[PDB]
């Protein structure tokens, strides 16, 4: 947590009286950045994170037919995800032998964990955990701009919607319940992350709430958690897109991580 000085760097002076983007919200009401292209200088951020020797874990579950998505997912992650930084891929799968042999860049590693003491394993191996769906591909840069204690990503189908249209859990009997007059954003579970400690907090809360609903005979739990524990960054839909369903709107300067058609 002691941080060394940055080196001399040459880049354009930020302009106090020029908004960064005039077409989108770039900060939430609790002062968390909303990550859009144009908001960050990746050279500055790369320096800051490299100087801390940052390691990023990327976790994916690939069960049954979803193993078929791993080759493209990992090949494209190699091109676009945290390039230059230490990356540990964690692939959770029922088919260890079906994980494709993907060639990795230096400083990058992959663990296969079979699914039908180790939570501490993430704590000792990585600084940040990023949790994504495997039936996706990277098409453009996804880097250290996303890293923060806790982040969620705007659901691409709902970023322009009013909160009453959000498909939050609406049954008051559920632990996930959000009433019509509450809600900041509609976050999608396909891309979230943060420090290991904050990600483990989130998944522990979600698991307990789901068990409680289960006992009572009942994205919703994620959305409840992030309502009540505000993320320290929010990722724009550049980070979670479906071009076939939604096209390429002008508000998206890049399409970084997308559904496979
Ligand atoms: Hg800017
Ligand atoms: Hg995770
Ligand atoms: Hg939750
Ligand atoms: Hg969750």
């Amino acid at each position: 947590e002691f941080m060394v000085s940055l080196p001399r760097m040459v880049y354009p002076q930020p302009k106090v009286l020029t908004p960064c983007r005039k077409d989108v919200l770039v900060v939430t009401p609790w002062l968390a950045p909303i990550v859009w292209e144009g908001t960050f200088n990746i050279d500055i951020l790369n320096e800051q994170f490299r100087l801390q020797n940052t390691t990023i874990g990327l976790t994916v579950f690939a069960i049954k037919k979803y193993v078929a998505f791993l080759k493209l997912f990992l090949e494209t992650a190699e091109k676009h995800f945290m390039v230059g930084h230490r990356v540990h891929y964690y692939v959770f799968t029922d088919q260890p032998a079906a994980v494709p042999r993907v060639t990795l860049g230096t400083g990058r590693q992959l663990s296969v964990l079979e699914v039908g003491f180790c939570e501490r394993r993430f704590l000792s191996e990585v600084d940040y955990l990023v949790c994504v769906d495997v039936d996706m591909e990277f098409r453009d840069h996804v880097g250290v701009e996303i890293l923060t204690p806790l982040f969620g990503t705007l659901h691409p189908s709902f970023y322009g919607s009013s909160r009453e249209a959000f498909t939050y859990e609406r049954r008051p009997q559920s632990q996930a319940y959000i009433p019509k007059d509450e809600g900041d954003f509609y976050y999608m579970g396909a891309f979230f992350g943060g420090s290991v400690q904050e990600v483990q907090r989130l998944t522990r809360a979600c698991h307990q709430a789901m068990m409680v609903d289960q006992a009572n005979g009942i994205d919703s739990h994620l959305n409840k958690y992030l309502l009540r524990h505000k993320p320290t960054k929010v990722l724009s839909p550049e980070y979670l897109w479906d071009q076939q369903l939604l096209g390429w709107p002008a508000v998206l300067r890049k399409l970084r991580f997308t559904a496979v058609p």
Side-chain angles (χ1 to χ4, degrees), residues 1-116 118-261:
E1 179 265 351
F2 177 71
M3 255 288 298
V4 165
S5 302
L6 293 164
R8 153 182 170 86
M9 292 174 72
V10 179
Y11 52 79
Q13 189 196 341
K15 305 157 84 174
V16 173
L17 302 175
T18 301
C20 182
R21 296 276 304 251
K22 317 189 203 225
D23 51 336
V24 294
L25 183 63
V26 306
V27 71
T28 73
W30 56 92
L31 300 175
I34 311 180
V35 184
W36 300 92
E37 181 63 12
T39 65
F40 57 94
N41 182 133
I42 196 61
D43 303 314
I44 300 171
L45 298 173
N46 277 328
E47 279 286 344
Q48 291 181 311
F49 283 87
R50 274 304 304 146
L51 288 169
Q52 311 176 247
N53 243 108
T54 302
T55 302
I56 311 93
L58 180 58
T59 68
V60 281
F61 286 70
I63 294 320
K64 299 172 116 295
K65 88 211 153 172
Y66 282 89
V67 296
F69 293 98
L70 280 165
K71 182 171 193 284
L72 182 65
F73 175 87
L74 292 165
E75 283 176 347
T76 62
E78 283 296 304
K79 295 194 181 283
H80 295 297
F81 185 76
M82 303 292 166
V83 178
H85 295 278
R86 279 182 91 238
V87 171
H88 198 146
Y89 298 99
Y90 303 90
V91 173
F92 294 90
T93 185
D94 59 348
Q95 297 158 81
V99 174
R101 192 209 69 208
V102 175
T103 306
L104 310 183
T106 189
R108 305 174 73 99
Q109 72 177 294
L110 186 141
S111 303
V112 178
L113 303 319
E114 186 168 10
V115 302
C118 74
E119 248 26 43
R120 314 168 55 242
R121 202 200 139 164
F122 287 139
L123 286 158
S124 59
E125 298 190 338
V126 307
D127 302 303
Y128 293 95
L129 213 41
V130 180
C131 313
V132 303
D133 284 3
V134 73
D135 53 337
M136 304 286 292
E137 57 175 319
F138 293 85
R139 296 190 23 194
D140 209 332
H141 169 93
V142 174
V144 303
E145 71 282 358
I146 78 178
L147 301 175
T148 192
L150 178 56
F151 70 86
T153 303
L154 299 178
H155 188 127
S157 292
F158 294 87
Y159 65 93
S161 298
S162 64
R163 51 159 67 121
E164 62 267 26
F166 291 167
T167 48
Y168 289 152
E169 177 61 62
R170 306 309 193 163
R171 300 165 287 174
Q173 302 77 28
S174 176
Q175 292 315 286
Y177 174 59
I178 303 168
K180 290 286 174 155
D181 57 353
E182 286 182 60
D184 304 309
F185 305 106
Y186 194 70
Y187 309 98
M188 193 175 191
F191 193 163
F192 65 94
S195 67
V196 175
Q197 173 171 228
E198 296 295 330
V199 172
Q200 289 181 156
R201 282 172 177 155
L202 181 158
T203 62
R204 182 181 312 126
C206 174
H207 187 246
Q208 293 180 192
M210 294 169 107
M211 293 188 82
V212 174
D213 277 8
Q214 241 267 290
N216 293 161
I218 313 157
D219 284 354
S220 72
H221 290 92
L222 176 61
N223 274 282
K224 181 61 171 280
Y225 186 77
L226 297 177
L227 176 62
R228 295 308 161 89
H229 305 80
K230 303 301 189 202
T232 54
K233 298 179 169 170
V234 174
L235 306 187
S236 68
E238 303 169 352
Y239 290 87
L240 190 50
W241 200 253
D242 182 336
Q243 192 173 7
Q244 169 177 74
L245 227 47
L246 299 169
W248 192 340
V251 71
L252 304 187
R253 300 185 181 177
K254 295 186 171 183
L255 298 187
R256 308 171 185 276
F257 184 58
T258 64
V260 177

